[PDB]
C-alpha cells in the first residue's frame, strides 16, 4: 500500500505528488507502476527519465492539459517523454 | 492550525502565516486551511502543484500584487496556477 | 558494490540513473567505468559538461536521441559522444 | 532579545545581530525589534526568503551590491517598500 503523498526521484530531480495523480490515467505507464519498484539510496521511488521534463508530465496528470514556458525549446523531447509514459492525448497535444 | 504553516508544494518547501493562506475568501487555500489534510513524510502540509511557481502565488497572497523577475517566461503557467488556486484578480493581472 | 540507482555529479550537475543504464553499451567509457573519482559528498564524479550529459543519458536510456528544436550544440554533443565512446550516437549526430 | 537573532524568512534561515535590526529607525524591522515564531522557535518573517539576503546586506552596509545580471531588482524594490527602507527603494529606482 502506497502513501497518499508519493516522493519521486526522476533522473536526479525530486518531485512530490498524490498517489491519485499517478494512477489518474488508466493503461498509462505511471498507472501500471503505481497500481497495486526501484528506489534510490534515500528510499524515494526512482524513474530513469529526464528529470527536468517530468515537471510538464506531472502538470499534464494534474490538469489533463499543460501550459509550457514561452519559447520552450524541448517540445519534441517532452513528446518523447509523453510516449514513454504512454500518454497518447499528451503526445497528440505536442504534435503540430 | 499553527500561526506559521510549513508547506510542501510539489517538492518545494515554503513557510507562511496561516492568515496569509486564508486572506482571500472562496479561494482554494482559504477552503483548504479552513479553521473547521495530506502531509509528506516530514509532516509538511502537501499541495499537489508546481512548486517553483507557488513563490509568486504566495507573494500575491502577501501583497495583493506580484512583481515578476525580468523577462519571466512562465506568465501563462502562473496564470494556470492562479486559476487552480481560484484567485480571479491575479488571473486578471496575468492576462 | 555498485547500487541499483547510481548518484552522479557530471561537472556540477547531479544526475541519478540505474546501474544497468551505465553498463548498457559494452566497450563504451561508462561501461568501462561501472562494469573511481568522487566529490566531497561521495557522488561519482565525471569531469564533463553538466548541461550536455542529459542528452548522453537519454541516448543510454532509449538508444535514440531527441534534441531540443534549433539545438545549436550538435557539434559539442558529438564531441561528448566521442569522449564517452558511443560510436552509434556519433553517427546519429553527423 | 538575544545579541544574535535567528530568523526564518519564508523558509530561509538568517542570523544577524540585534543591533542590525535596530539600525534603521522607523523601518519595519526596527518597529518589530524595539512576535510570530516557527516550530523551531525562530522569529518568523512572512516574506520572500531569497530576496531577504540583499535586505540584510543593506541593513549591514547601508548599501547593497547585487549579483551581475540580477533579474529581481523590481521584486527586491517591493521587499524594500515592505521593510520600509526608503533609501534602498531610491537606490533600486
Amino acid at each position: 500500500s502506497f502513501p497518499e503523498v508519493v516522493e519521486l526521484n526522476v533522473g536526479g530531480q525530486v518531485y512530490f505528488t498524490r498517489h491519485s495523480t499517478l494512477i489518474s490515467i488508466p493503461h498509462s505507464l505511471l498507472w501500471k507502476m503505481f497500481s497495486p519498484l526501484a528506489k534510490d539510496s534515500k528510499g524515494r521511488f526512482f524513474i530513469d527519465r529526464d528529470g527536468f521534463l517530468f515537471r510538464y508530465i506531472l502538470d499534464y496528470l494534474r490538469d489533463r492539459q499543460v501550459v509550457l514556458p514561452d519559447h520552450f525549446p524541448e517540445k519534441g523531447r517532452l513528446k518523447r517523454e509523453a510516449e514513454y509514459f504512454q500518454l497518447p492525448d499528451l503526445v497528440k497535444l505536442l504534435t503540430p | 492550525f499553527p500561526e506559521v504553516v510549513e508547506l510542501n508544494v510539489g517538492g518545494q518547501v515554503y513557510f507562511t502565516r496561516h492568515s496569509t493562506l486564508i486572506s482571500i475568501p472562496h479561494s482554494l487555500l482559504w477552503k483548504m486551511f479552513s479553521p473547521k489534510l495530506a502531509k509528506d513524510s516530514k509532516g509538511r502540509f502537501f499541495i499537489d502543484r508546481d512548486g517553483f511557481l507557488f513563490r509568486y502565488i504566495l507573494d500575491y497572497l502577501r501583497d495583493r500584487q506580484v512583481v515578476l523577475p525580468d523577462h519571466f517566461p512562465e506568465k501563462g503557467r502562473l496564470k494556470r496556477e492562479a486559476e487552480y488556486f481560484q484567485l480571479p484578480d491575479l488571473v486578471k493581472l496575468l492576462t | 558494490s555498485f547500487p541499483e540507482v547510481v548518484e552522479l555529479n557530471v561537472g556540477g550537475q547531479v544526475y541519478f540513473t540505474r546501474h544497468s543504464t551505465l553498463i548498457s553499451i559494452p566497450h563504451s567509457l561508462l561501461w568501462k567505468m561501472f562494469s573511481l573519482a568522487k566529490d566531497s559528498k561521495g557522488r561519482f564524479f565525471i569531469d564533463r559538461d553538466g548541461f550536455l550529459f542529459r542528452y548522453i543519458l537519454d541516448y543510454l536510456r532509449d538508444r535514440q536521441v531527441v534534441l531540443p528544436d534549433h539545438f545549436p550544440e550538435k557539434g559539442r554533443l558529438k564531441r561528448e559522444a566521442e569522449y564517452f565512446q558511443l560510436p552509434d550516437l556519433v553517427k546519429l549526430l553527423t | 532579545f538575544p545579541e544574535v537573532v535567528e530568523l526564518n524568512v519564508g523558509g530561509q534561515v538568517y542570523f544577524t545581530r540585534h543591533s542590525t535590526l535596530i539600525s534603521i529607525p522607523h523601518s519595519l524591522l526596527w518597529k518589530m525589534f524595539s512576535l510570530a515564531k516557527d516550530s523551531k522557535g525562530r522569529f518568523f518573517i512572512d516574506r520572500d526568503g531569497f530576496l531577504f539576503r540583499y535586505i540584510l546586506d543593506y541593513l549591514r552596509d547601508r548599501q547593497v551590491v547585487l549579483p551581475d545580471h540580477f533579474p529581481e531588482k523590481g521584486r527586491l524594490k517591493r521587499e524594500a517598500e515592505y521593510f520600509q527602507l526608503p533609501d534602498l527603494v531610491k537606490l533600486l529606482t
Binding site: E74 | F52, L53 | - | -
Partner: peptide, 12 residues
C-alpha cells in the same frame, strides 16, 4: 547548474 526552468526559477 541552471538548466531550463532552474535558470530563472529559484527553488527550496
Amino acid at each position: 547548474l541552471p538548466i531550463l526552468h532552474h535558470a530563472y526559477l529559484p527553488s527550496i
